[PDB]
Structures are given as C-alpha cells and as structure tokens.
Amino acid sequence: CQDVVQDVPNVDVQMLELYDRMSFKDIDGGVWKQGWNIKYDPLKYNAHHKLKVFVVPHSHNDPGWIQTFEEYYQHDTKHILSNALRHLHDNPEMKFIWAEISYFARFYHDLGENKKLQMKSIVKNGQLEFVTGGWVMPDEANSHWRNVLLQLTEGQTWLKQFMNVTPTASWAIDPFGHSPTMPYILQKSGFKNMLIQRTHYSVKKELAQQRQLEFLWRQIWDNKGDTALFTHMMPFYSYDIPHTCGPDPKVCCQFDFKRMGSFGLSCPWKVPPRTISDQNVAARSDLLVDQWKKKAELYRTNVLLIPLGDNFRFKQNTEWDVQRVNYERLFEHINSQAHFNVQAQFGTLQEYFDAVHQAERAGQAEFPTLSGDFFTYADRSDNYWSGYYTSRPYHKRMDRVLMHYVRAAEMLSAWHSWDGMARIEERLEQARRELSLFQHHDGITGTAKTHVVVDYEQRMQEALKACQMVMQQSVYRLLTKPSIYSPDFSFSYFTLDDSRWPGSGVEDSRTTIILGEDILPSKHVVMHNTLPHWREQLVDFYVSSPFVSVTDLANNPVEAQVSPVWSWHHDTLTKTIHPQGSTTKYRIIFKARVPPMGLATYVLTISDSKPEHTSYASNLLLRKNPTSLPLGQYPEDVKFGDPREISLRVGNGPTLAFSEQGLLKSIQLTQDSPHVPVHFKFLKYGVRSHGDRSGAYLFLPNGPASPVELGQPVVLVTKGKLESSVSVGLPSVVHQTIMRGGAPEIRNLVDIGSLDNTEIVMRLETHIDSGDIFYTDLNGLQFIKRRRLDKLPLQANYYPIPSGMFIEDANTRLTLLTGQPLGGSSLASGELEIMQDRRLASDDERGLGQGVLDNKPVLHIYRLVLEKVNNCVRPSKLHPAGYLTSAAHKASQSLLDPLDKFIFAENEWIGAQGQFGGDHPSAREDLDVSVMRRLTKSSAKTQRVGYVLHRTNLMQCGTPEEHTQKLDVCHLLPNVARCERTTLTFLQNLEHLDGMVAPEVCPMETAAYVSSHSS
Ligand SMILES: *[C@@H]1O[C@@H](CO)[C@@H](O)[C@H](O)[C@H]1NC(C)=O
C-alpha cells in the first residue's frame, strides 16, 4: 500500500498551490473575452506535420431541467435519436457522440426490431459512439461517490447487454465545476480518457498559457500515479458552437449552420452563418482554419478537438443536412489546399483521444501531471456557482436517504436467489434508475423547474417504496424458520420505521406500535446493520403506552428509556414557536446490537405499571409565561422555568453547555478538561438590490451574514439516562442538540417560510487557531484542504459540503458531519458555517427562468465532533489532503448508513428467529462493503454476487486497534466456485483470484469482486 499521509505527491499542477499564486483578475482579453489575442507561427504546420482536426457532433440532453425527463423525451430527444439513426444510417461518413443512457435506453426499448438492428450496426461500425455511458452526466459537487458509481454502472450495464460496448472515454460538458472523484471511479472502471468543460475562467486562462489543458489527473494523495487519468479541459466559456471552434465567438458563430433564420436562431455577434458555396469557400476556410490554429496553440499535439453541438441539437432532419453539407464543403476545400497543412474530418471522442496518444507515443508531446479539484466554478466576473450546493435542500437530503435504502435493499435481498414472481429484480432496477436519474446535474443540484423538481421527488418516493418492499420481504425470509416461511410477495410482513425521514415536523408518517392488555401485549421489531462490523446504536419507536419493556429473543431484558413525543407548532395565535406533547404516544429508546451486515430481533411488551428496565426522561420547559403541558399516561410531570443557561452530560461522554437561548456554548470533553468555547449561531444572507441577483445556481450575497433576531425563544430540555436533548424554536428553525454519550447529533427542522431573498446559515464559532485553512469532502470520498482567499469574494470561498467539514490547529479539531449535501465555508479563523436553505425571488440568468420559491420544511441532520488531535499523525503542512479520526468517521456512518428498523405488521410472527449474520466477519473499522448486489437471476446455473469494497484512511492518534477479522467477500456466500476482481461496474474481469479469496484493499482504495456459486 501507498502511504496516503506522509508522502506529498510531486505534481506539475497542484490546484491549491495554483490558487494561492493566481491573481484572478477579470480583464478584457479582446474577442476571447477571458483570455488574450492568440498568436501562432504559420510555419508550425507543414506537409510533414499537418494539423489533424476532429469535428465531433453532439447534442446535450438534460434528463429533466425546464421540462421533465418524459416531456423532453417526447418533445425533443426521441426526435434527435430517431434522426441520428436515419442520418448516420444514410451517411456513412457522419459521426455522433451520445452521453445520457437514460434517454438512449428509453428510445432503444421502443424501437422495432429492424431499427434496433440498424442502431447496433451504426454503433458497431463507429459512427455513433457512447461517451461515459452513465445513466446521466452527474453533478460532481453534491453527488455521493456511491451514487456516481451506481448511475455509471446502470448505464454501462445497459450498454454492455444491448449495444455490446463499454465506453472508455468520458464526456462531462455541463456539471458546474469538476471533482477528482470522477477520474478516481472512471480509471477504476476501465476508462482511459476524460473531458471536462465548466471550470473557472481564470483557471482556463492560466492552464491555456502553459498549455496545461491536457493533463494526467491523479488523486491528491497519490504519490506513485496509478490513479492518473488523461484529461482534456476545453479552453473556452461554453461548449456551444460559438465557443468551440476557436477564441472568437463572432467568427465561430458563423459556422453554426443552424443559425441562419428558419430555425429561429441567430448570432448575438450580429454576423450570421452563410451557406458555403464554391464562391465563398476559400474566404470561409481562411477564417475557420485561422480559428482552429489559434485553438491548437493552447494544446501540445497536432491533433485538435472541435466539438460541434449545443443543447438538444440535431433534432430536425434539415438540421443534420445543413450542418453536414456545409462542413463537408469546408473539409473538401481545406484538405485539398496544401498551404493550410490541415486534415479535417468528422470524428468521435475516442478517435480524438486515440490520435492524441499516438502523437504522444511518437515523442511529439509530454503531458503535465495535476492533482486537485475544480471548485468553486465562476463562468464570469464574480458570478460563483456556490448557490446550487444548497438549492432545494429537501431533495438533497432525500438523495442520501434513498442512497442508503438502495444499498440496504440490494444487500438484504442479495443473500438469496428469488423467484421471478417476487419481483425483486424489477423493484431494485426501478429504485436504482430513479436514484441514478436524480444524480443529473439539474437533479440533486436543485436547478430544475418547480414541476421538474416535483417529478424527481415523485420518482424518488416510488423508489423508496420499492426499496421498503424488497427490504421487508428479505427480512421475513432471513429470520423465519425455512419450513415455516410462506411468502406472499405482495404482502407487507414489516413496515419500515425511519426516525429522520421525512422527519418529525416534516411529515407524520411513522406508525405507532399499538399495544394494550385487551388488544396486543407485544410486538417484534427487527434492526438491520448494512455495515460490515458489529454495531450498537440507539433506536427509537413510537408506542401507545409508556409502560413498555424491551427484551431480545433470548428474553434477556434490554435497558430502555421512554420520552414524550414533542412536536413544534408556530402558533399563529400567540405568535410563538412552542412544543406540544402527545397524550397518546411515546418514544421508547434502547440500544440495539446487530451483527456485521446482519439482523437482530427485539420484543416490546406492555405492562400495567413502570417496568423494571425502563426509565423515564424528565422534561423542562424554559419560557417566561408558561402554561401546562399534560402528557397523558407519562409518569413524570413537565417542569417549568425562566430561560437560563443549562449543562448536560449523557453517560461518560462530553458535557455540553447551552446559552439561555438553547444554543451550544461550550463542550467539555472529560470531568477535568476545559469548557472549550463552541457556539452555534444562526445568521442570514440577503441578495443585492442592484447588480447580479442570487438564484438557483449563483450565490451573490449582499455582504457578510447578519444574526437572526431570536427574541426570547422557547427551550425544551429532555434529560434521560440513555438520551438527553435541548431543542429551541427559532425563527425558521427548530434547532435540536441530541446527546447519547458521544459526539452530539444536531437536527434542524428548517422552514424558511415566505422569507424572500434570504439564505439561512448555521455557523460554529470557536477559538481554534485555524487561520485561513479548512477541510471539506469531495463526494463523501475524500477530504481536501481549502484555503480561504480574501483576494476572492465571499461566494468564491463557499465549497460543497457533501458529507463533512473541519477546522483544526496544533491541538484541537472541530468536525461537522452532514446527512445531506449543503454549501459551506470557514470565513474566519475558528469558524465553520453551512447553509440550511435559501429562498430567492429572482432568476440568475443561467436558463432556469425562475427563482427558488418552492421551499418546504426539511430535517437537516449532523454530528458535531470536538477532538484533541495533538497526538495524531497528520499530513505535513504541504500535503493537499486531510483525514478523519475514527470517531468522526463512525459519526459520518451513523448519519449516512444508520440501522434500519422494521416493525412486524401482523399480531404473530410464526417461526421468528433472533438473529442473522452472527457469523459474518467483523471487519476493520476503515473498511466498508459499499455495494453487495446479486448480478444473476434465479434461472442462471452459475450465480454471481458483486461486491464493492472501499477502505477509507483514518488518523493514527494512539488508540490501539481492536481485534478484527479479515473480510473475504467471496466466501460470504456458500459453495463458491470462483472469485474475480472486476472493474467497479462489474463489467470486466481483471484478475482470477487464487483460493477464491478476495484480498482486502489499501487505504483510500476501492476494489470490486464477483463471487460465482454453483446453484
Ligand atoms: C461483442 O463485440 C466483440 C468484442 O469486442 C465480439 O468479439 C463479440 O462477438 C461481440 N458480441 C456480439 C457481436 O454479439
């Protein structure tokens, strides 16, 4: 294994380093507004050294944006693909590249058999070429790496089966900034080349000047370079035709032949395209070749890429003809005029890359190495695209919930082969596709139109239901005596119980377990643990009585705590936000202990009076002017008091102090230790009253945030043996700090209401001496060092927080982990902040044509980890990466992959078993089984099960490692006949494994394995 901590990679371009040196001045560069007047030596190309030009036709198709997926498919995309089929069929020299497999599968599935055969033939012969081949072209900021892999696999699996092809070149022209998570996954999935477009205009200018637009992109911790993927960054402002032939869009627009009038398009530079004829071809070629040669100066080989397309292009018949015919006239003249020393043709992306590497292999060019990311994107001036890190946060949170449900459903059902009647494969495919779709750069980003957002939500809700069905059928099968097991595959044996989605105050969706001495004395519940190690976690259920005790299936008592069910109401009468307690239901909380990748059964039993092993939380309502809060049968009376500072300690854990406003003030790690100042504060950003307005994409604050005026909020304190909390009703936020004896859990019920042109931020203020340094993660995969740059505006210092962020000094670290992607920063030494929601009245001129006014209540969840780090082995000052501690990593897992909870849905579960997976290896804490998926249907003689194994890297801080078992995924299922290492998509075998044993992977590495079994 490479050491990912101690060796700083030597790269030609390191993006943090580059950022620190670059000036970012937005000067008018001339016709190339953000560059300079490119000059070239006309003698550079000659008879023995021509410029080879590849014109690559394309059509950018959004799986939802202004219209829904189905709306665009009917109105645009089906016609684009129908016309691509006809035109490439009829014109053997024409070429086309296709990215979005969601649309292609939809199209192909509907084709008659004759047309399917024509399609396969134009793919086989190289005319139509798939680039990337993911279900979508995903967002790279907010997306979890697990979902990037999911959508990639979904599209490429379809492509393999039906098209007999696996793309090795990637095309990402529209995501708003770019992540190194992409080459990480792609290089581990057989890719050899990738292309990106949306990077900061200053970065384009800088890399162009050094001819560093093509580079070997390696991971920030990769000293050796085996992660490297050849990357082509496009140089200009857009992927559109005007910004792809060369530096001058006034000229380039004249070679978009769709802009002459009849298609209702034109050139904003006031010079139209003209039909090419024998009388203008020479002057037209003069102009075009001059653009090409200027573009070529920015790169190192004699092979030039010329994208030809735009959004939903190549729709009409006549469009194909007008582009093709005019370009071919230009090619015939240009190629036959020796003095140009050019050979131009239509090409695909792979053709371009193949030729580039041929040039490379002939000693013609050597490429620079690079590490780092390409956030935060600005396309012009101070217009930084940090708004979409937060936009539509409800759906961002939903993404993470569905992420886990898909994993849990695939894992739980993978243990068995299923009859076709069970419709397991069907339900899983549906869920994978809907989650995959949401990865689109207008999905999770929250940059789609309101009705499109609703469509994504509906699609995700159906996916959730599908996952629930598969999960509960799987639990019933895994925990029932086989000779008793009697499935009705449409029946609900268990209902899922999710405490945090949609969340208390968002939706009353949770069922109460209804017990009574005259109705039902007891209820079986089951916990699932998708993680490959033994796990304890507190779990809660609603019950119709506070007199309930908990046992395991050996009938051993389990210590439990009962608390009231509190809901917060903005009372329009009193104008306060205050809690009401249920008089008919209660929360029972207990510690579940569940095997690695396994299940554990418990029983909740009613009694007449207080059970021996159940305790009751005290409650304290802090408020001037209190009124009574009756709690039905709850055995302990609510106390009242004037607002005051409070202090709480659960277990042996930290002691937390709170202000009289109910907000964290300090954390004391142990009995003796200092009360370390850690203050939560809620603030608000506004919008500019003139100049550019914030929208779904852009964050353009009118200065630093101002404190939310809190008034005298109502604070509710609940104190229990197992769990305590402080909740406070703030304007727009019910803020909750929960304690269970380790790092606190934070929950925000965020309802921005009708507060227009407001962004709500949650800030942490400490005295940690972090200076201008902070760390944020990329796609839940890695943590990257950020440096606050005061030479950049506030919105430029905002970064994606897809899963976590931290600050540290020599001695102390504060880490905030999230259960949802949001935007955030550290705008001053000792601070962390993260945006909660934003409501914007105006459009920000990127095509959406609307503000963001469709906010809905969302339960944000976090863990807050204060640690001493003076004993930790950290990377040197010059290393671009950071690493979590064991505790911070476990905290992230608790948010993203909690125990799943199942309530048995009938009165009696006949043949119930107590446990599943007690013999599963409990693997080292840094290792995860990210994916377990059965890859064959029941009729396959040889069964195959695919596993994705990921190892993170945790800091060595002097905690001795616990004894753990080697995890060999190929022996998790019986009767193994083969173990293969594969690409991460499972589509290519890379290594036949001796002894049928799957090795564990190295820190920061990800491997895939497929075990084969005799049926
Ligand atoms: C898939 O493509 C090829 C491998 O590159 C052929 O070897 C193989 O026959 C093909 N499968 C077909 C054409 O059905």
Ligand SMILES: OC[C@H]1O[C@H](O)[C@@H](O)[C@@H](O)[C@@H]1O
């Ligand atoms: O301007 C932002 C915008 O870029 C492109 O035009 C699109 O195709 C969209 O997906 C995206 O939202």
Ligand SMILES: [Zn+2]
């Ligand atoms: Zn797009």
